[PDB]
């Protein structure tokens, strides 16, 4: 009878996922609100990005959405109640309480929003038994903008029911007066052919055995491990729905985390990793023990398997979660990352071929053209990732507004919309036809200051038939529009890009780069299913890894360690490792042979760790000696390594041993004057000159030998010799655009939290690099 009790075949999994998909309530609910809340017509609210062409399929906001602006009355700061009557009895999935706060908000207000049924704070005490989604902090719903957001009011009680609601918004300008605008949408459960679908959903929610079986099938600990990737996708859809509804499932997740992390981030694709990241974000948001520490333990237990991960896009989400959750047990994360980095750097250095060194030096090319296995592809924690798993989508412009057109200024050619007259606040559009219904997964439209906003609508049959709004980017003028790994990837043949010119601008002609679109030209049978859609219309692992996978792992580990130092006892540890010998090994492995980013990040990590240690100057002088002596046959980018060394010394110049050791090295090199390695003298003199620019007996010796050098003398070296001599003499004292379809499900706050995690990690890395 119940789908919960049956074996988890693809049919049962498909039915269970169908029992969780949502629709927007087709006829708009009626509402009564306090007088201080005044309704605004949805056409006015959507004037910038009109939706009228979707009216034929009820896609416009006037059919499901109410919006009220607040008038700052005497008591507008205090309790408010929105009574909401639905057109008909229905299986309500959730209530989307969108909000916009005043731009001049100093601190995010402390407002609780709760959902109740019609016939703790006193109003909720009186209506305690009718509470349908407990008090949710308004701040929980914030978008990345800081003053905006959404609360997806939902609960098991809401699912266990079927005409009227109350939204109680109480502040614990003051309080609710900081809430400039509110809007409400209601979303029901899709119409399913499944018998007793209400009881089916109840069974999904109540039974712990169901959660245990879901975890087991996800972890492939059932049915001989022959659970398909699509089955895992369906299981994660069900798990995400359960986590969103509930906020015992957490107990099963905590007990099987290590396996869940392994299966989702190391053995599956980008989509599975992203869905598991959303599930784990929901679990994080959810009297039980904290989930963050357990997730950290699972991630660090699986860290050793990173060289055996299947896709780069999967590793991206692993490291996003790890970087967010490292705050717990900082020392343990540091130890794991350092151990794996040291293990991987040795192999990466061992994998450098002479042809690769020649490419790096003679041409500055750091790819491995002889190794066919790439691991990750990016476009630009601020970029699209895992683009190897998706296909670049070619498109042809089929219609344009006015005289605008597209022009071209395997991957599709870079194309841009040329618009002859942009005006200000003027709408222009371009319709791109992919030639066939394609499975759209990623979009990147670069920043364009020429336009105030951009919007993407998608359809297959016609704009009025099955038109969907894919995204609205209001900050496209200042930020790139990046839609990364659309979890319910849309199916689209036609994409309408609608751009609005910048407010206060008459730049006659505009050239807007259309950007890049990724996905699949072949839609799999289950990826086009009208069902399952919302709103339908150990050391051997390192040895066997590829060079590119090791490079990606090194990049992520270096970023993790840099952010670890920024977030700093983690420096107390990383002293037992990354001592003088370990520091030298890591430099030799990564800064000499590594990619420019790996080189830079390893160098800066080494400064921030050991830059203040006594042996640091000896380390730098030893590196200079070993790498630039005329007897060194090693092929490496001497110029790039020297720039790295100069940066390292400049940022470590507070260490008195740096310049002391470099001047002692210069002294030893000039000893023959009082065998002469002129190129090493040149390198050392240039480095010391830059370090002195950034700013007794031993100094007497070095300056004397410099004098003998210039007396016994190339002309170019003489200038720097004189500069360094003078400097040494004088130096001594005694001389953002989410996909619009996330609103329909329970995975919008999870996606916002994932984006917040990525943004915080990027900010931490940038701060660490720019110390």
């Amino acid at each position: 009878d119940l789908l919960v009790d049956q074996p988890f075949t693809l049919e049962i999994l498909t039915s269970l996922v169908e029992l969780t998909r949502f629709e927007t309530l087709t006829p708009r609910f009626s509402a009564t609100v306090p007088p201080c809340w005044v309704e605004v017509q949805q056409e006015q609210q959507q004037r910038r990005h009109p939706q009228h062409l979707h009216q034929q399929h009820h896609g416009d906001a006037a059919q499901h959405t109410r919006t009220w602006k607040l008038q700052t009355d005497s008591n507008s700061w205090d309790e408010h109640v929105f009574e909401l009557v639905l057109p008909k009895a229905c299986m309500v999935g959730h209530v989307d309480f969108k909000f916009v706060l005043n731009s001049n908000i100093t601190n995010i207000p402390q407002i609780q929003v709760t959902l109740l049924k019609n016939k703790l704070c006193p109003f909720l005490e009186d209506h305690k038994e009718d509470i349908l989604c407990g008090p949710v902090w308004l701040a929980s719903g914030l978008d990345l903008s800081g003053h905006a957001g959404m609360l997806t009011l939902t609960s098991p009680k809401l699912v266990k029911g079927m005409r009227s609601f109350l939204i109680h918004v109480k502040a614990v300008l003051r309080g609710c007066d900081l809430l400039q605008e509110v809007s409400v949408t209601i979303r029901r459960f899709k119409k399913t052919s499944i018998s007793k679908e209400r009881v089916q959903r109840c069974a999904m929610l109540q039974f712990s055995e169901f959660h245990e079986k879901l975890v087991n099938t996800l972890c492939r600990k059932t049915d001989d491990g022959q659970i398909t990737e699509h089955a895992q996708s369906l299981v994660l859809d069900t798990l995400c729905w359960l986590a969103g509804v509930h906020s015992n499932l957490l107990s099963k997740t905590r007990k099987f985390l290590s396996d869940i992390v392994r299966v989702c981030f190391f053995e599956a694709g980008r989509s599975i990793a992203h869905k598991c990241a959303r599930f784990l974000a929901l679990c994080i948001s959810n009297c039980q023990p904290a989930f963050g520490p357990v997730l950290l333990k699972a991630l660090l237990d699986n860290m050793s398997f990173l060289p055996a991960a299947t896709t780069g896009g999967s590793v991206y989400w692993y490291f996003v979660l790890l970087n967010y959750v490292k705050d717990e047990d900082l020392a343990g994360c540091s130890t794991a990352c350092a151990s794996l980095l040291t293990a991987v750097s040795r192999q990466l250095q061992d994998r450098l071929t002479p042809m690769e060194a020649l490419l790096q030096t003679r041409y500055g090319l750091y790819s491995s053209p002889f190794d066919p296995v790439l691991f990750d592809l990016e476009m630009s924690f601020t970029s699209l990732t895992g683009l190897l798993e998706v296909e670049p989508l070619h498109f042809t412009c089929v219609s344009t507004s006015d005289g605008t057109r597209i022009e071209r200024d395997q991957p599709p050619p870079h194309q841009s919309i040329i618009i002859e007259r942009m005006h200000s606040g003027a709408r222009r559009f371009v319709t791109l036809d992919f030639g066939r219904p394609i499975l759209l997964t990623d979009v990147l439209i670069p920043t364009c200051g020429d336009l105030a906003s951009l919007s993407i609508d998608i359809w297959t049959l016609g704009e009025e038939v099955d038109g969907r709004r894919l995204v609205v980017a209001t900050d496209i003028s200042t930020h790139s529009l990046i839609l990364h790994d659309l979890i319910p990837p849309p199916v689209c043949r036609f994409m309408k890009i609608t751009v609005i010119g910048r407010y206060g601008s008459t730049n006659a002609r505009a050239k807007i780069p259309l950007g890049f679109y990724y996905g699949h030209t072949y839609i799999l049978p289950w990826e086009s299913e009208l069902k399952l859609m919302h709103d339908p219309l150990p050391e051997d692992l390192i040895q066997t890894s590829s060079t590119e996978q090791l490079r990606t792992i090194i990049r992520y580990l270096l970023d993790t360690l840099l952010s670890l130092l920024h977030a700093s006892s983690v420096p107390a540890v990383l002293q037992s490792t990354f001592h003088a010998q370990a520091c030298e090994e890591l430099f030799k492995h990564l800064c000499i042979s590594g990619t420019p980013k790996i080189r830079l990040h390893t160098g800066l990590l080494l400064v921030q760790l050991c830059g203040g240690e006594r042996w640091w100057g000896q380390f730098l002088s030893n590196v200079l000696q070993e790498l630039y002596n005329s007897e060194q046959l090693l092929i490496f980018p001497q110029d790039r390594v020297f720039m790295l060394l100069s940066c390292i010394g400049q940022r470590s110049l507070s260490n008195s041993g740096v310049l002391e050791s470099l001047l002692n090295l210069l002294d030893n090199l000039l000893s023959p004057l009082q065998v002469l390695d002129i190129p090493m003298i040149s390198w050392v003199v240039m480095l010391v000159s830059r370090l002195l620019d950034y700013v007794h007996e031993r100094c007497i010796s070095v300056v004397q030998k410099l004098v003998l050098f210039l007396l016994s003398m190339h002309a170019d070296l003489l200038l720097f010799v004189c500069k360094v001599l003078a400097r040494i003499a004088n130096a001594t004292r005694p001389t953002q655009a989410l996909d619009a379809r996330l609103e329909v499900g329970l995975e919008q706050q999870a996606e916002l939290m994932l984006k917040m995690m990525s943004t915080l990690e990027a900010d931490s890395i940038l701060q660490a690099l720019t110390n």
Side-chain angles (χ1 to χ4, degrees), residues 86-117:
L86 299 189
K88 298 187 294 183
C90 68
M91 276 163 308
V92 170
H94 53 94
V95 181
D96 307 299
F97 177 92
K98 293 163 275 250
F99 59 90
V100 174
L101 297 151
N102 294 305
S103 30
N104 80 44
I105 52 104
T106 296
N107 60 342
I108 294 148
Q110 280 172 93
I111 307 156
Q112 289 180 351
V113 182
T114 176
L115 185 86
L116 308 99
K117 300 258 205 164

Short mmCIF file of all heavy atoms in Angstrom, two decimals, residues 86-117:
data_model
loop_
_atom_site.label_atom_id
_atom_site.label_comp_id
_atom_site.label_asym_id
_atom_site.label_seq_id
_atom_site.Cartn_x
_atom_site.Cartn_y
_atom_site.Cartn_z
N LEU A 86 -7.86 30.86 1.29
CA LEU A 86 -7.59 30.27 -0.01
C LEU A 86 -8.87 30.12 -0.82
O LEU A 86 -9.96 30.00 -0.25
CB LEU A 86 -6.92 28.91 0.16
CG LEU A 86 -5.57 28.88 0.88
CD1 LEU A 86 -4.95 27.50 0.77
CD2 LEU A 86 -4.62 29.94 0.33
N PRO A 87 -8.77 30.12 -2.15
CA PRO A 87 -9.99 29.91 -2.96
C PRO A 87 -10.67 28.59 -2.68
O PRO A 87 -11.91 28.52 -2.67
CB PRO A 87 -9.47 29.99 -4.40
CG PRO A 87 -8.10 30.59 -4.31
CD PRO A 87 -7.56 30.21 -2.98
N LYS A 88 -9.90 27.53 -2.44
CA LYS A 88 -10.45 26.20 -2.24
C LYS A 88 -9.57 25.45 -1.25
O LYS A 88 -8.41 25.80 -1.03
CB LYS A 88 -10.54 25.42 -3.55
CG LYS A 88 -11.46 26.03 -4.59
CD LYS A 88 -11.63 25.11 -5.79
CE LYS A 88 -10.33 24.92 -6.56
NZ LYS A 88 -10.50 24.09 -7.78
N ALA A 89 -10.14 24.40 -0.65
CA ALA A 89 -9.34 23.50 0.17
C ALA A 89 -8.33 22.78 -0.71
O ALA A 89 -8.66 22.30 -1.79
CB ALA A 89 -10.24 22.50 0.88
N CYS A 90 -7.08 22.72 -0.24
CA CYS A 90 -6.01 22.12 -1.02
C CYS A 90 -4.94 21.59 -0.09
O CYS A 90 -4.90 21.92 1.10
CB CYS A 90 -5.40 23.14 -1.99
SG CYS A 90 -4.49 24.47 -1.18
N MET A 91 -4.08 20.74 -0.64
CA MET A 91 -2.91 20.24 0.07
C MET A 91 -1.82 21.29 -0.04
O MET A 91 -1.12 21.40 -1.04
CB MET A 91 -2.46 18.90 -0.50
CG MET A 91 -3.22 17.70 0.06
SD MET A 91 -3.05 16.19 -0.92
CE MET A 91 -3.49 16.75 -2.56
N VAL A 92 -1.69 22.10 1.01
CA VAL A 92 -0.75 23.22 0.98
C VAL A 92 0.65 22.71 1.29
O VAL A 92 0.88 22.06 2.31
CB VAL A 92 -1.18 24.31 1.97
CG1 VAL A 92 -0.08 25.35 2.12
CG2 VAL A 92 -2.48 24.95 1.51
N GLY A 93 1.59 23.01 0.40
CA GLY A 93 2.97 22.61 0.59
C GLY A 93 3.70 23.56 1.51
O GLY A 93 4.24 23.14 2.55
N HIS A 94 3.73 24.83 1.15
CA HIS A 94 4.38 25.83 1.98
C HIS A 94 3.84 27.21 1.64
O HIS A 94 3.11 27.40 0.67
CB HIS A 94 5.91 25.80 1.82
CG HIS A 94 6.38 25.89 0.40
ND1 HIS A 94 6.72 27.08 -0.19
CD2 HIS A 94 6.57 24.93 -0.54
CE1 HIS A 94 7.10 26.86 -1.44
NE2 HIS A 94 7.01 25.56 -1.67
N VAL A 95 4.18 28.17 2.49
CA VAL A 95 3.83 29.57 2.28
C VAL A 95 5.13 30.36 2.16
O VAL A 95 5.95 30.36 3.09
CB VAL A 95 2.96 30.12 3.42
CG1 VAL A 95 2.60 31.57 3.17
CG2 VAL A 95 1.70 29.28 3.57
N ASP A 96 5.32 31.02 1.03
CA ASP A 96 6.49 31.85 0.78
C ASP A 96 6.18 33.26 1.27
O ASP A 96 5.35 33.96 0.69
CB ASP A 96 6.86 31.84 -0.70
CG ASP A 96 7.00 30.44 -1.24
OD1 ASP A 96 7.87 29.70 -0.76
OD2 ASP A 96 6.22 30.08 -2.16
N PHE A 97 6.85 33.66 2.35
CA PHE A 97 6.75 35.00 2.92
C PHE A 97 7.99 35.75 2.47
O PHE A 97 9.04 35.70 3.11
CB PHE A 97 6.64 34.92 4.43
CG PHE A 97 6.60 36.25 5.13
CD1 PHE A 97 5.39 36.87 5.40
CD2 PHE A 97 7.76 36.88 5.52
CE1 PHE A 97 5.35 38.08 6.05
CE2 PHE A 97 7.73 38.09 6.17
CZ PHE A 97 6.52 38.70 6.43
N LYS A 98 7.89 36.40 1.31
CA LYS A 98 8.97 37.25 0.83
C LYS A 98 8.92 38.60 1.53
O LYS A 98 7.85 39.07 1.92
CB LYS A 98 8.87 37.46 -0.68
CG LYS A 98 9.09 36.22 -1.51
CD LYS A 98 8.58 36.40 -2.93
CE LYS A 98 7.10 36.09 -3.02
NZ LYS A 98 6.85 34.83 -3.76
N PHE A 99 10.08 39.22 1.68
CA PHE A 99 10.15 40.50 2.35
C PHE A 99 11.29 41.33 1.78
O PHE A 99 12.29 40.79 1.29
CB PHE A 99 10.34 40.34 3.86
CG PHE A 99 11.59 39.60 4.23
CD1 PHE A 99 12.78 40.28 4.44
CD2 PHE A 99 11.58 38.22 4.37
CE1 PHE A 99 13.92 39.60 4.78
CE2 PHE A 99 12.72 37.54 4.72
CZ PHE A 99 13.90 38.23 4.92
N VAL A 100 11.11 42.64 1.85
CA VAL A 100 12.14 43.61 1.50
C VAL A 100 12.24 44.60 2.65
O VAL A 100 11.23 45.20 3.05
CB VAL A 100 11.83 44.34 0.19
CG1 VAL A 100 12.85 45.44 -0.06
CG2 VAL A 100 11.80 43.36 -0.97
N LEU A 101 13.45 44.76 3.19
CA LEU A 101 13.70 45.73 4.25
C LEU A 101 14.18 47.04 3.65
O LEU A 101 14.68 47.09 2.53
CB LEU A 101 14.74 45.18 5.23
CG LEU A 101 14.35 43.92 6.01
CD1 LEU A 101 15.59 43.11 6.35
CD2 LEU A 101 13.58 44.26 7.27
N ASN A 102 14.02 48.12 4.42
CA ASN A 102 14.50 49.43 4.00
C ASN A 102 16.01 49.37 3.77
O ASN A 102 16.73 48.68 4.50
CB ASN A 102 14.17 50.48 5.05
CG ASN A 102 12.67 50.71 5.19
OD1 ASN A 102 11.98 51.00 4.22
ND2 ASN A 102 12.17 50.60 6.42
N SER A 103 16.48 50.07 2.74
CA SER A 103 17.90 50.05 2.43
C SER A 103 18.73 50.60 3.60
O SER A 103 19.86 50.17 3.82
CB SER A 103 18.16 50.86 1.16
OG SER A 103 17.21 51.90 1.03
N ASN A 104 18.17 51.56 4.34
CA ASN A 104 18.90 52.22 5.43
C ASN A 104 18.75 51.45 6.75
O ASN A 104 18.58 52.01 7.83
CB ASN A 104 18.45 53.68 5.51
CG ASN A 104 17.12 53.89 6.24
OD1 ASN A 104 16.84 53.31 7.29
ND2 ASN A 104 16.28 54.72 5.65
N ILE A 105 18.92 50.14 6.65
CA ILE A 105 18.84 49.24 7.81
C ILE A 105 20.25 49.11 8.37
O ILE A 105 21.16 48.59 7.71
CB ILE A 105 18.24 47.88 7.46
CG1 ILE A 105 18.94 47.22 6.27
CG2 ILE A 105 16.73 48.00 7.23
CD1 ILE A 105 19.89 46.09 6.64
N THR A 106 20.44 49.58 9.61
CA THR A 106 21.72 49.41 10.29
C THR A 106 21.94 47.95 10.66
O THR A 106 22.92 47.33 10.24
CB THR A 106 21.76 50.30 11.54
OG1 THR A 106 21.70 51.68 11.17
CG2 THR A 106 23.05 50.04 12.34
N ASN A 107 21.02 47.39 11.45
CA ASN A 107 21.08 45.99 11.86
C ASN A 107 19.83 45.28 11.39
O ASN A 107 18.75 45.87 11.32
CB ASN A 107 21.21 45.87 13.38
CG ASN A 107 20.04 46.50 14.12
OD1 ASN A 107 19.31 47.31 13.56
ND2 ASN A 107 19.87 46.12 15.38
N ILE A 108 19.98 44.00 11.07
CA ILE A 108 18.86 43.17 10.62
C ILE A 108 17.86 43.07 11.77
O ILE A 108 18.26 42.75 12.90
CB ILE A 108 19.34 41.79 10.15
CG1 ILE A 108 20.20 41.94 8.89
CG2 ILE A 108 18.17 40.86 9.87
CD1 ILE A 108 21.29 40.90 8.77
N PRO A 109 16.57 43.32 11.54
CA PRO A 109 15.62 43.32 12.66
C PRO A 109 15.36 41.92 13.20
O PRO A 109 15.49 40.92 12.50
CB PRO A 109 14.36 43.92 12.03
CG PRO A 109 14.42 43.49 10.62
CD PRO A 109 15.89 43.42 10.24
N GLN A 110 14.98 41.88 14.47
CA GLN A 110 14.65 40.63 15.16
C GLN A 110 13.14 40.43 15.15
O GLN A 110 12.42 40.77 16.10
CB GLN A 110 15.21 40.64 16.57
CG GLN A 110 16.70 40.31 16.65
CD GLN A 110 17.25 40.50 18.05
OE1 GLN A 110 17.29 39.57 18.85
NE2 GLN A 110 17.68 41.72 18.35
N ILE A 111 12.65 39.86 14.05
CA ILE A 111 11.23 39.64 13.83
C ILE A 111 10.98 38.15 13.69
O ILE A 111 11.65 37.48 12.89
CB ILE A 111 10.72 40.41 12.60
CG1 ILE A 111 11.09 41.89 12.67
CG2 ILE A 111 9.21 40.26 12.48
CD1 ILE A 111 11.16 42.55 11.31
N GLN A 112 10.03 37.63 14.46
CA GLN A 112 9.59 36.25 14.32
C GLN A 112 8.35 36.18 13.44
O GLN A 112 7.39 36.94 13.63
CB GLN A 112 9.28 35.65 15.69
CG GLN A 112 10.50 35.37 16.55
CD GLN A 112 10.12 34.77 17.89
OE1 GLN A 112 8.95 34.71 18.25
NE2 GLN A 112 11.12 34.32 18.63
N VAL A 113 8.38 35.27 12.47
CA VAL A 113 7.27 35.02 11.56
C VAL A 113 6.80 33.59 11.77
O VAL A 113 7.60 32.66 11.71
CB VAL A 113 7.67 35.25 10.10
CG1 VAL A 113 6.48 35.03 9.17
CG2 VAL A 113 8.24 36.65 9.91
N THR A 114 5.50 33.43 12.01
CA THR A 114 4.93 32.11 12.24
C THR A 114 3.63 31.96 11.46
O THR A 114 2.96 32.95 11.15
CB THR A 114 4.67 31.85 13.73
OG1 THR A 114 4.02 30.58 13.89
CG2 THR A 114 3.79 32.93 14.32
N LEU A 115 3.30 30.72 11.14
CA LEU A 115 2.08 30.40 10.40
C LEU A 115 1.14 29.62 11.32
O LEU A 115 1.57 28.71 12.03
CB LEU A 115 2.40 29.58 9.15
CG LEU A 115 1.23 29.27 8.22
CD1 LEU A 115 1.01 30.41 7.24
CD2 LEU A 115 1.48 27.97 7.47
N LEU A 116 -0.14 30.00 11.30
CA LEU A 116 -1.16 29.40 12.13
C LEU A 116 -2.39 29.09 11.29
O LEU A 116 -2.52 29.56 10.16
CB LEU A 116 -1.56 30.33 13.28
CG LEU A 116 -0.44 30.90 14.14
CD1 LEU A 116 -0.09 32.31 13.70
CD2 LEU A 116 -0.85 30.89 15.61
N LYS A 117 -3.30 28.30 11.86
CA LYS A 117 -4.60 28.08 11.24
C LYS A 117 -5.64 29.00 11.85
O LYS A 117 -5.55 29.40 13.02
CB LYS A 117 -5.04 26.62 11.41
CG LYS A 117 -4.10 25.60 10.80
CD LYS A 117 -4.62 25.08 9.47
CE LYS A 117 -4.08 23.70 9.14
NZ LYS A 117 -4.86 23.04 8.06
#
